[PDB]
């Protein structure tokens, strides 16, 4: 197969529901993922920012970081980087022609024999970063944590951003019962990084601790960020912890939620430092949070104009960008907002100056509003040229816009 069709084979795998499936690709595979070093993320919101920056932490120390991470923004091989380098094309269809032929295999033996996309990738994704010899690789879990496809690796560290309501049509009715399912990436005597988690949760956790002998850092217990504040499009804050201050790190991210993200990602890069007798230092630190820029989640990708891309996605995300908009923002601002109810909407309207709703681009359109983000977009510029935009509303939005813009 070439690149497209490779892409194509990848999107083509069923829906079905222990970890035997993977397992027994994996298997087949060598069992890479038993192999090598590991940081494990889970968590409502902040997973992917966490996973992010930790990594370019790491890899400005000098190791070789694989990260996997979802969803993609501007290409498929995103998904799958070394050192923030997506899988070239080349490889990528080497790598997918060696997992079907273990595939193939492996239905010869047991005749109804498959797994799932997100099966697949991960096995693929093992593999690529075993083959690689990358020192570590940090993965983000898809959904939970103790059923995740990612659940069959004993990592140096895990960690577990946050815990809400989001995925309960999959997790479960309480924040006990989602508490639960991602506490079970919890390991025996294996560390675990938190946020100042929810009672519900904190309890589950309290358990779990208990149970394995884990050492639990907390934020707001163990480490915080006493100081913190705009600067430019980003923030310079203060990290804190039992071994002290690391002073004015400056980070391209904007939002509050985003300090804890990066608390978190320190105190997990420092606590992995540790575990291996790595050296780690503050300006290796600096450095990493430098480049942890975050695609589609509150960038500004065009100053003349003034261009912003968000995927904010539910009421408290909308509230949350509101806040920042407003910090960020002093003169009148379009906001073009494409979602997927008619709260986090009205909320819109009743703050900003120009408000366009559209559709969200690879979505059914269900029963002020145009027709696409790109009339919206031409309609502004057209009327007042110098008028910053705002897209919001939708992941996939943000992304569709990027990769117009950008490409």
Same mark, same amino acid.
């Given at each position: 197969?070439?690149?497209?069709?490779?892409?194509?084979?990848?999107?083509?795998? =069923?829906?079905?529901?222990? %970890?035997?499936?993977?397992?027994?690709?994996?298997? /087949?595979?060598?069992?890479?993922?038993?192999?090598?070093?590991?940081?494990?993320?889970?968590?409502?919101?902040?997973?992917?920012?966490?996973?992010?920056?930790?990594? %370019?932490?790491?890899?400005?120390?000098?190791?070789?970081?694989?990260?996997?991470? &979802?969803?993609?923004?501007?290409?498929?091989?995103?998904?799958?980087?070394?050192?923030?380098?997506?899988?070239?094309?080349?490889?990528?269809?080497?790598?997918?022609?060696?997992?079907?032929?273990?595939?193939?295999?492996?239905?010869?033996?047991?005749?109804?024999?498959?797994?799932?996309?997100?099966?697949?990738?991960?096995?693929?994704?093992?593999?690529?970063?075993?083959?690689?010899?990358? #020192?570590?690789?940090?993965?983000?879990?898809?959904?939970?944590? #103790?059923?995740?496809?990612?659940?069959?690796?004993?990592?140096?560290?895990?960690?577990?951003?946050?815990?809400?309501?989001? %995925?309960?049509?999959?997790?479960?009715?309480?924040?006990?019962?989602?508490?639960?399912?991602? /506490?079970?990436?919890?390991?025996?005597?294996?560390?675990?990084?938190?946020?100042?988690?929810?009672?519900?949760?904190?309890?589950?956790?309290?358990?779990?601790?208990?149970?394995?002998?884990?050492?639990?850092?907390?934020?707001?217990?163990?480490?915080?960020?006493?100081?913190?504040?705009?600067?430019?499009? !980003?923030?310079?804050?203060?990290?804190?912890?039992?071994?002290?201050?690391?002073?004015?790190?400056?980070?391209?991210?904007?939002?509050?939620?985003?300090?804890?993200?990066?608390?978190?990602?320190?105190?997990? /890069?420092?606590?992995? &430092?540790?575990?291996?007798?790595?050296?780690?230092?503050?300006?290796?630190?600096?450095?990493?949070? /430098?480049?942890?820029?975050?695609?589609?989640?509150?960038?500004?990708?065009?100053?003349?104009?003034?261009?912003?891309?968000?995927?904010? %996605?539910? =009421?408290?995300?909308?509230? !949350?960008?509101?806040?920042?908009?407003?910090?960020?923002?002093?003169?009148?601002?379009?906001?073009?907002?494409?979602?997927?109810? &008619?709260?986090?909407?009205?909320?819109?309207?009743?703050?900003?100056?120009?408000?366009?709703?559209?559709?969200?681009?690879?979505?059914?359109?269900?029963?002020?509003?145009? #027709?696409?983000?790109?009339?919206?977009?031409?309609?502004?510029?057209? #009327?007042? =040229?110098?008028?910053?935009?705002?897209?919001?509303?939708?992941?996939?939005?943000?992304?569709?816009?990027?990769?117009?813009?950008?490409?």
């Amino acid at each position: 197969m070439n690149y497209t069709e490779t892409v194509a084979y990848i999107h083509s795998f =069923p829906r079905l529901a222990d %970890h035997r499936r993977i397992l027994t690709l994996l298997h /087949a595979l060598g069992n890479p993922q038993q192999q090598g070093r590991y940081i494990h993320v889970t968590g409502t919101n902040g997973k992917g920012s966490a996973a992010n920056a930790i990594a %370019h932490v790491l890899e400005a120390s000098g190791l070789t970081v694989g990260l996997y991470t &979802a969803p993609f923004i501007m290409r498929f091989n995103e998904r799958i980087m070394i050192d923030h380098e997506p899988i070239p094309d080349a490889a990528l269809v080497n790598a997918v022609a060696f997992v079907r032929a273990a595939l193939e295999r492996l239905q010869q033996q047991q005749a109804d024999f498959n797994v799932t996309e997100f099966e697949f990738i991960t096995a693929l994704g093992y593999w690529y970063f075993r083959q690689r010899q990358v #020192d570590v690789a940090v993965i983000e879990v898809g959904i939970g944590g #103790d059923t995740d496809s990612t659940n069959v690796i004993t990592p140096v560290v895990s960690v577990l951003t946050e815990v809400a309501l989001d %995925h309960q049509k999959l997790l479960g009715h309480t924040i006990t019962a989602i508490a639960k399912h991602k /506490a079970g990436i919890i390991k025996r005597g294996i560390p675990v990084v938190t946020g100042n988690l929810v009672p519900d949760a904190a309890a589950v956790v309290a358990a779990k601790v208990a149970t394995t002998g884990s050492q639990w850092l907390r934020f707001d217990r163990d480490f915080s960020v006493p100081k913190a504040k705009l600067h430019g499009w !980003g923030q310079r804050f203060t990290y804190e912890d039992q071994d002290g201050r690391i002073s004015d790190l400056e980070v391209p991210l904007v939002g509050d939620y985003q300090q804890r993200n990066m608390a978190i990602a320190i105190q997990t /890069a420092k606590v992995y &430092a540790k575990q291996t007798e790595w050296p780690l230092t503050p300006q290796n630190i600096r450095q990493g949070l /430098a480049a942890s820029h975050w695609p589609a989640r509150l960038e500004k990708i065009s100053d003349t104009p003034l261009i912003v891309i968000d995927g904010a %996605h539910n =009421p408290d995300g909308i509230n !949350g960008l509101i806040t920042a908009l407003k910090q960020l923002f002093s003169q009148p601002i379009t906001v073009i907002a494409g979602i997927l109810y &008619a709260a986090m909407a009205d909320r819109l309207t009743a703050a900003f100056s120009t408000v366009y709703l559209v559709p969200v681009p690879g979505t059914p359109r269900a029963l002020r509003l145009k #027709d696409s983000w790109q009339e919206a977009l031409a309609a502004s510029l057209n #009327d007042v =040229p110098d008028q910053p935009i705002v897209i919001t509303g939708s992941l996939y939005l943000a992304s569709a816009v990027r990769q117009t813009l950008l490409g």
